[PDB]
Amino acid sequence: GKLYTLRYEVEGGGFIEIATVRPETVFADQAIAVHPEDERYRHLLGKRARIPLTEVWIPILADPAVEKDFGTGALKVTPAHDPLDYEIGERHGLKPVSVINLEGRMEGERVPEALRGLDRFEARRKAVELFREAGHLVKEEDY
Ligand SMILES: C[C@@H](O)[C@H](N)C(=O)NS(=O)(=O)OC[C@H]1O[C@@H](n2cnc3c(N)ncnc32)[C@H](O)[C@@H]1O
d(CA 143, CA 135): 23
Q: Which atom of ligand 1 is nearest to the CA of 81?
A: 1
Ligand 1 center from residue 24 Cα (angstroms): 14
Resolution in A: 1.8
Evaluate the CA torsion angle 36, 38, 43, 45 in order and state its sign.
negative
CATH of the domain at 57: 3.90.740.10
Q: Indicate the number of domains in the chain.
A: 1
C-alpha of residue 69 to centroid of ligand 1, in Å: 12
Report the first-to-last Cα separation within the chain, whole angstroms: 6
- Nearest-angstrom CA–CA distance, 45 and 50: 14
Across the strands, what pairs with 20?
Answer: 4
Using CA atoms, how far residue 108 sits from 35, 111, 113, 118, in Å, is 30, 5, 9, 12
Strands (E), the chain: 2-10, 15-20, 31-34, 48-50, 57-62, 75-77, 137-142
The whole domain housing 134 covers 1-143
What is the number of other CB atoms lying within 10 angstroms of the CB of residue 102? 7
Helices (H), 6-62: none
> Which of 61, 84, 100, 143 for mutating ligand 1's site (highest number of atoms within 8 Å of CB)?
84
- CA distances (Å), 9 to each of 48, 57, 65, 93, 117, in order? 9, 9, 24, 23, 27
